[PDB]
C-alpha cells in the first residue's frame, strides 16, 4: 500500500501521537481519587517497538499495548473517605509532573522531526515522476 518511507514516517507520527495522548491523559488525572469502579488511576506508559518487517534491516515504530505503571501508589491519610483502607490511606495516582512535561516536549519534537522528513522526501517523490515524461 504505502511507500516504505511513507509507512515509516506515518507510523512514527502515529506513535508520537499515542505517546502524547498518554502523557495528556496522565496529566489530566494527576489528582483523581477514584475511577468509575472504585480503584485509583494508574499512570499509563507506552512502549515503542520497531516494526521490523524484513529481517533486521529497517522498519517503523509500532506500539504493542499501553501498560499500567508499577510504582508505589501515593498514600494520603484521609480516614473519612469511603475509599480509605483499614489504616485509612486513600490511594492517589503515581503520576509525576516533570516526567510528563518532558515526555510531551520530546513527543512533540519527534513528531515535528518526522513531519520535516516527510516534507523533505515529498519534493523528491514528485520530481521522480518527471523522469518518464
Amino acid at each position: 500500500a504505502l511507500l516504505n518511507i511513507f509507512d515509516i514516517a506515518g507510523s512514527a507520527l502515529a506513535a508520537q501521537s499515542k505517546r502524547l495522548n498518554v502523557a495528556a491523559s496522565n496529566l489530566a488525572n494527576a489528582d483523581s481519587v477514584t475511577g468509575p469502579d472504585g480503584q485509583p488511576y494508574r499512570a499509563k506508559q507506552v512502549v515503542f517497538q520497531v516494526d521490523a518487517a524484513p529481517g533486521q534491516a529497517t522498519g517503523g515504530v509500532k506500539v504493542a499495548s499501553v501498560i499500567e505503571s508499577q510504582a508505589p501508589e501515593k498514600l494520603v491519610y484521609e480516614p473519612g473517605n469511603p475509599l480509605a483502607d483499614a489504616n485509612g490511606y486513600v490511594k492517589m495516582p503515581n503520576v509525576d509532573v516533570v516526567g510528563e512535561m518532558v515526555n510531551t516536549m520530546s513527543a512533540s519534537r519527534s513528531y515535528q522531526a518526522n513531519i520535516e522528513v516527510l516534507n523533505t522526501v515529498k519534493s523528491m517523490m514528485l520530481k521522480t515522476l518527471t523522469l518518464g515524461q
Binding site: 504505502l2 516504505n4 524484513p54 529481517g55 534491516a57
Partner: peptide, 13 residues
C-alpha cells in the same frame, strides 16, 4: 536485497 528502497511498496504485504 536485505534493505528495501524508500520508494518501494510497503515490504509488509
Amino acid at each position: 536485497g536485505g534493505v528495501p528502497g524508500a520508494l518501494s511498496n510497503q515490504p509488509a504485504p
